[PDB]
Nucleic acid binder design. Structure first.
Ligand SMILES: [Cl-]
Ligand SMILES: [Cl-]
Ligand SMILES: [K+]
Ligand SMILES: [K+]
Ligand SMILES: [Mg+2]
Ligand SMILES: [Mg+2]
Ligand SMILES: [Mg+2]
Ligand SMILES: [Mg+2]
Ligand SMILES: [Mg+2]
Ligand SMILES: [Mg+2]
Ligand SMILES: [Mg+2]
Ligand SMILES: [Mg+2]
Ligand SMILES: [Mg+2]
Ligand SMILES: [Mg+2]
Ligand SMILES: [Mg+2]
Ligand SMILES: [Mg+2]
Ligand SMILES: [Mg+2]
Ligand SMILES: [Mg+2]
Ligand SMILES: [Mg+2]
Ligand SMILES: [Mg+2]
Ligand SMILES: [Mg+2]
Ligand SMILES: [Mg+2]
Ligand SMILES: [Mg+2]
Ligand SMILES: [Mg+2]
Ligand SMILES: [Mg+2]
Ligand SMILES: [Mg+2]
Ligand SMILES: [Mg+2]
Ligand SMILES: [Mg+2]
Ligand code: NA
Ligand code: NA
Ligand code: NA
Ligand code: NA
Ligand code: NA
Ligand code: NA
Ligand code: NA
Ligand code: NA
Ligand code: NA
Ligand code: NA
Ligand code: NA
Ligand code: NA
Ligand code: NA
Ligand code: NA
Ligand code: NA
Ligand code: NA
Ligand code: NA
Ligand code: NA
Ligand SMILES: [Sr+2]
Ligand SMILES: [Sr+2]
Ligand SMILES: [Sr+2]
Ligand SMILES: [Sr+2]
Ligand SMILES: [Sr+2]
Ligand SMILES: [Sr+2]
Ligand SMILES: [Sr+2]
Ligand SMILES: [Sr+2]
Ligand SMILES: [Sr+2]
Ligand SMILES: [Sr+2]
Ligand SMILES: [Sr+2]
Ligand SMILES: [Sr+2]
Ligand SMILES: [Sr+2]
Ligand SMILES: [Sr+2]
Ligand SMILES: [Sr+2]
Ligand SMILES: [Sr+2]
Ligand SMILES: [Sr+2]
Ligand SMILES: [Sr+2]
Ligand SMILES: [Sr+2]
Ligand SMILES: [Sr+2]
Ligand SMILES: [Sr+2]
Ligand SMILES: [Sr+2]
Ligand SMILES: [Sr+2]
Ligand SMILES: [Sr+2]
Ligand SMILES: [Sr+2]
Ligand SMILES: [Sr+2]
Ligand SMILES: [Sr+2]
Ligand SMILES: [Sr+2]
Ligand SMILES: [Sr+2]
Ligand SMILES: [Sr+2]
Ligand SMILES: [Sr+2]
Ligand SMILES: [Sr+2]
Ligand SMILES: [Sr+2]
Ligand SMILES: [Sr+2]
Ligand SMILES: [Sr+2]
Ligand SMILES: [Sr+2]
Ligand SMILES: [Sr+2]
Ligand SMILES: [Sr+2]
Lengths: 132, 337, 53
RNA sequence: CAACC
RNA sequence: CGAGUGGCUUGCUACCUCGAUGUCGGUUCCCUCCAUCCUGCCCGUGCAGAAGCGGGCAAGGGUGAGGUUGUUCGCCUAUUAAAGGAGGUCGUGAGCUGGGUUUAGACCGUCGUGAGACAGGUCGGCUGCUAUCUACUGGGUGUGUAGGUGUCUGACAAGAACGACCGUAUAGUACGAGAGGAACUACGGUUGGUGGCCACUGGUGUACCGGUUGUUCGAGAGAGCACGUGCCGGGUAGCCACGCCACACGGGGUAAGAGCUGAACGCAUCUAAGCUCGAAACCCACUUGGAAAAGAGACACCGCCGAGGUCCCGCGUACAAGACGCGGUCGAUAGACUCGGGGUGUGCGCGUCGAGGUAACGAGACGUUAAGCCCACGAGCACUAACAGACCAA
RNA sequence: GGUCUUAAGGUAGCGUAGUACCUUGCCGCAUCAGUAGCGGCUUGCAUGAAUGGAUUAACCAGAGCUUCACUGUCCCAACGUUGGGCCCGGUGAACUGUACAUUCCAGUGCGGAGUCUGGAGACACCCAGGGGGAAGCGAAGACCCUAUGGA
RNA sequence: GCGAAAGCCAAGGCCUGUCGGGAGCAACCAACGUUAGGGAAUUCGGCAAGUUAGUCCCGUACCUUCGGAAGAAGGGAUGCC
RNA sequence: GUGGAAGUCUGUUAGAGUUGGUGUCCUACAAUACCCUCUCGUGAUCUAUGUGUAGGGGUGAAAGGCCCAUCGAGUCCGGCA
């Protein structure tokens, strides 16, 4: 993928439960897999800010519940490092549901997003209210 | 089904024993290209700090922007090429033929060797030039040594001696180039060889850790879950199969870890100066203060503070040189805190 | 930059920026300040702080 | 599959 | 239908072991095989492209995470370049596990008149040992080569030290009616592996500073105990990874394959002689070890009445003993002291305030006070201690 | 089959069961995915009434399953604490020992060799280590069979 | 303090749960403390560890042999002067 | 409201016991030990001393358990070489 523009310490693994920062009707997402990732023996697959992941809906509306969808990680509690040396961290871990074309399934994003996630997913960004 | 997995640790840096010479010894040298010139230099590690640099990379989306970069401060005072050794090619490889020494010696070079009192530089030179006429001359190298005394933070006064190859134009020309340096007094500096922005390979003897177990030394797993409470926590599963009925040298075991020579490739020289611009408030921890000739190396360098590190023009650079990077800031914030 | 907590200048190439839930941003110069903030202490009530001084 | 069936 | 190869399954035999070679599965750690799943290079196609399908060379590297089940296998899920198979006493219990299997207790079904039986099911159910030799990982002392210091050589030896992927430009281009949709090359990044390092972030930090509960020292001050910190908050050095840095290109020879010249065979023919090319594979490049390489090495200087070395002393860039390294007055090597740089968070005492209370008394607040206390770091400084002195040596 | 053996021929209930071989039975629930678990169905290899059937509040260091919470069980390991370990004084055993023994790769051999054969490697001694091998030590195999053995 | 509970302290007893000396004291082992983010992914199985916790107030389901279930659950309070 | 029942609850009160760690130990401190966790603790309770039951016999809320480290028939000596 296109360089992210910052170094990331993945703060999530397969199985982690995160916030769905949108209005798709999904409230909580479970990480199932990480796009393009391949680990090593015994290593739990990890995902962090900027990765595209496959998720299952754990909490939300009946129609959304249990659906296996694609998403993009927009916030994480574990710090990331920007070119100027500063570390950046969020209040929670969150992702936004996305389609085949990486366009947000929802109409609105909830909460801030990392600028780096913009470079990658512009259409996701063109839905963000706050970009930090 | 027993999943695959690469083995633990590299088999390419063995045996993992205590280094024989604390002074690093390059086992390779740059190729002959430019004008004749000494292919290396040395200094003493002081510590680290960081600097803000203007992205120099012409292919980076950030070209021309502020960028914080880690730097290891190495004190690199002038050294003294004290002699010119000549190697001759033989059926059994390269062998020392003779050496051409000088008269002017640093006041304390006698703390390491028996300094010459009676030597014939012309007889030696004569034998060398005849070797060249015959076409039996191998490469040409300079016996070099440091001046620890010039570095206050380093307690040693005894000079560290190393042989550094001289490459360059034609042999005849670099032979003459070698002799010129030596004759003077051999005194040369970091500037004379490197330029800020070029890539250097740094060699040094890593920090010693004495005896350590397989987990730390080779990176094998610790025993997991229930297997961690029965009496075995940091011991590998087994030393090998029933057959072969012997333990292979490839199974990870305890032993000396650290204090090994390492040659780290493509280290970018961020800046070569002199003074106290890089020094840190309160002084570098366990080292002291810097106020003299110094070199800022991008990233990390093997070895503890005070150890002798060696520089050599990168023999396998991946990127082209982007000379004299613009340094907008050099942290002097205390390293204690 | 200045530390949004204690008031001292943040040494460049240092510190962490915490992004609040509502999108706000707090630039901390160190863990000490972050940790006091997590305890719910307000910088003005801590004598050692520039904000206080 | 680790004896008996 | 016919001919074989393997020794992964099963069967057969009863050769070895019953004065015992511990029994499935898993796990951990190491080496290997190729009948190749991916990656490299090719050939064919019912090959436009993209993509399939089949075949060849090839074992360098990779081949992962999860749900049921003790399971092997298998079924299933999301990822992936791919998530290949097999050997090593079905590698691996003087390594682990003990779910299964495999005693003694008990139940069910079936069988048995009964005692009792069942690779049928089910609940419970014990795992000893201070390593002699050998093997290897690291560390020393000697001898040999035959006075000392310093610097090297390189026979050999090890490496995967690098493997793979995504994205952008190429290009909505070549190709194709359209749909769809490449490549050479140049770039940015990710991942797995590898070595190292601590400026940054993060952990630790029973150094240290503070808060505070119970109790004891009459109160105060200052302390002990509450497990090797009572508990809680912060955290220096150091050590660390979750942090940071670095880890090619290019040559040479080939395989499959593409060809050239070319005859046997006037022609033809990539082959018989000769030659041009051509794989992640082989060799070199690069890193690491390496004078005990018995052809036991090379060079320079010093010394043979003295070069150098040992003991001794102060110490760590070193360290389980040993080893290693630095300094020893021609000195800043360690400590003290003073600064600097750091940690904590505002000391004791006193003064004002303080809900009240006749008063006594009074939790606590402000000031004095960026205070007090403390520091495994740095500088300065010969104040103390590196003194005195003994010995070997061609 | 629409009686026959041998008296009767399974009623109420329960049912893929701690009983179902087939079997991961079929449907549903739950999970991204559930040979598990629960509900239903059920022709029950081979359930069933004091050989007690069914059912059941309370109880339980009894067996199985799910959820919330939490966490170094795990990703993936780090630093620290105390006692050992290491060095020194003193004290001072045992196990085990046919012999020889510096081994490695192959082969051979009663087919599972440090000792045979061919090669390779190998200067002696010592310290620490984790245990690959000595089909390691410990116990005349408890399994299996055999004995005109025992209980 | 509810307490013959814990913890601390008297009276009384002891330094004999009887080998010491030394190395910032390495690997490794026994006990144990602290671990960012994720939170059972580990495993036959949450085994081990942890979480909760005392007292008062509010409030408390299915089911039930009407006893119980029940401290269900869930919520709030807690010092000193 | 009183009352204070219960093979009733909590409880390392004393005392009794022992689910798990398959922890420590396994030439042991110990021929059955140590630590944490755990169960019972007004009763078919626990416990001291005395006393009775004897080997094809006892005793057994039944495990072939126990009858002096010995039990699907104790120990000793004899039969017996
Ligand atoms: Cl995955
Ligand atoms: Cl393990
Ligand atoms: K049997
Ligand atoms: K046998
Ligand atoms: Mg695994
Ligand atoms: Mg620091
Ligand atoms: Mg800082
Ligand atoms: Mg036989
Ligand atoms: Mg054995
Ligand atoms: Mg092949
Ligand atoms: Mg291989
Ligand atoms: Mg096996
Ligand atoms: Mg074994
Ligand atoms: Mg065993
Ligand atoms: Mg053992
Ligand atoms: Mg079981
Ligand atoms: Mg069982
Ligand atoms: Mg059986
Ligand atoms: Mg069922
Ligand atoms: Mg009846
Ligand atoms: Mg026998
Ligand atoms: Mg038998
Ligand atoms: Mg009989
Ligand atoms: Mg943690
Ligand atoms: Mg698993
Ligand atoms: Mg438990
Ligand atoms: Mg009695
Ligand atoms: Mg019985
Ligand atoms: Na053990
Ligand atoms: Na074995
Ligand atoms: Na065959
Ligand atoms: Na096994
Ligand atoms: Na391969
Ligand atoms: Na499975
Ligand atoms: Na075996
Ligand atoms: Na075992
Ligand atoms: Na096993
Ligand atoms: Na080639
Ligand atoms: Na019946
Ligand atoms: Na009970
Ligand atoms: Na832990
Ligand atoms: Na062994
Ligand atoms: Na004594
Ligand atoms: Na009444
Ligand atoms: Na117990
Ligand atoms: Na009898
Ligand atoms: Sr295996
Ligand atoms: Sr050298
Ligand atoms: Sr070399
Ligand atoms: Sr065990
Ligand atoms: Sr063998
Ligand atoms: Sr035997
Ligand atoms: Sr082949
Ligand atoms: Sr391929
Ligand atoms: Sr199966
Ligand atoms: Sr098998
Ligand atoms: Sr079992
Ligand atoms: Sr079975
Ligand atoms: Sr049975
Ligand atoms: Sr000899
Ligand atoms: Sr493209
Ligand atoms: Sr199109
Ligand atoms: Sr204490
Ligand atoms: Sr507490
Ligand atoms: Sr060819
Ligand atoms: Sr020699
Ligand atoms: Sr019926
Ligand atoms: Sr019943
Ligand atoms: Sr032989
Ligand atoms: Sr040992
Ligand atoms: Sr007393
Ligand atoms: Sr005594
Ligand atoms: Sr702490
Ligand atoms: Sr689980
Ligand atoms: Sr699981
Ligand atoms: Sr509560
Ligand atoms: Sr009771
Ligand atoms: Sr009780
Ligand atoms: Sr047990
Ligand atoms: Sr425990
Ligand atoms: Sr025992
Ligand atoms: Sr009572
Ligand atoms: Sr007995
Ligand atoms: Sr007799």
């Amino acid at each position: 993928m296109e360089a992210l523009g910052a170094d990331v310490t993945q703060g999530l693994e397969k199985g982690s439960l995160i916030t769905c920062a949108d209005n798709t009707g999904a409230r909580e997402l479970k990480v199932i897999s990480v796009h393009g990732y391949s680990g090593t023996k015994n290593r739990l697959p990890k995902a962090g800010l900027g990765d595209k992941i496959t998720v299952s809906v754990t909490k939300g509306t009946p129609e959304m519940r249990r659906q296996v969808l694609e998403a993009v990680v927009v916030r994480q509690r574990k710090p990331i490092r920007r070119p100027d040396g500063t570390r950046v961290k969020f209040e929670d871990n969150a992702a936004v549901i996305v389609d085949e074309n990486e366009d947000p399934r929802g109409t609105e994003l909830k909460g801030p997003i990392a600028r780096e996630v913009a470079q990658r997913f512009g259409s996701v960004a063109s839905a963000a209210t706050m970009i930090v | 089904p027993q999943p695959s997995r690469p083995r633990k640790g590299s088999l390419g840096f063995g045996p993992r024993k205590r280094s024989t010479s604390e002074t690093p010894r390059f086992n390779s040298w740059p190729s002959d290209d430019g004008q004749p010139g000494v292919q290396g230099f040395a200094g003493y590690k002081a510590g680290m700090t960081h600097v803000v640099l203007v992205n120099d990379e012409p292919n980076s989306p950030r070209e021309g922007m502020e960028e914080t970069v880690p730097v290891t401060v190495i004190e690199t005072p002038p050294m003294r090429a004290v002699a010119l050794r000549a190697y001759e090619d033989t059926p059994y490889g390269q062998r020392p033929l003779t050496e051409v020494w000088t008269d002017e010696f640093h006041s304390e070079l006698d703390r390491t060797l028996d300094v010459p009192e009676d030597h014939d530089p012309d007889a030696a030179e004569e034998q060398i030039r005849d070797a060249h006429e015959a076409g039996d001359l191998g490469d040409l190298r300079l016996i070099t040594h440091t001046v620890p005394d010039a570095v206050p933070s380093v307690p040693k006064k005894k000079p560290d001696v190393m042989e550094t190859r001289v490459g360059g134009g034609s042999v005849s020309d670099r032979l003459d180039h070698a002799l010129d340096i030596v004759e003077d007094g051999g005194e040369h500096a970091m500037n004379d060889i490197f330029r800020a922005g070029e890539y250097a390979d740094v060699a040094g003897v890593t920090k010693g850790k004495g005896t350590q177990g397989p987990v730390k030394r080779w990176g094998v797993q610790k025993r997991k879950g229930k297997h961690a409470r029965q009496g075995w926590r940091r011991r590998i599963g087994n030393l090998g199969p029933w057959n072969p009925s012997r333990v292979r040298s490839t199974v990870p075991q305890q032993g000396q870890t650290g204090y090994h020579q390492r040659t780290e490739l493509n280290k970018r020289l961020i800046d070569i100066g002199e003074g106290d611009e890089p020094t840190v408030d309160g002084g570098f921890v366990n080292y002291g203060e810097v106020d003299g000739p110094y070199t800022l190396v991008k990233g990390s360098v093997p070895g503890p503070d005070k150890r002798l590190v060696r520089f050599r023009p990168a023999v396998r650079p991946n990127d082209q040189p982007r000379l004299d990077p613009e340094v907008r800031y050099v942290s002097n914030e205390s390293n204690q805190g | 930059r200045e530390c949004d907590y204690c008031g001292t200048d943040i040494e460049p190439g240092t510190g962490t920026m915490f992004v609040h839930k509502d999108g706000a941003t707090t630039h901390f110069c160190s863990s000490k300040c972050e940790n006091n903030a997590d305890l719910g202490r307000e910088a003005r009530n801590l004598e050692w702080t520039d904000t206080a001084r």
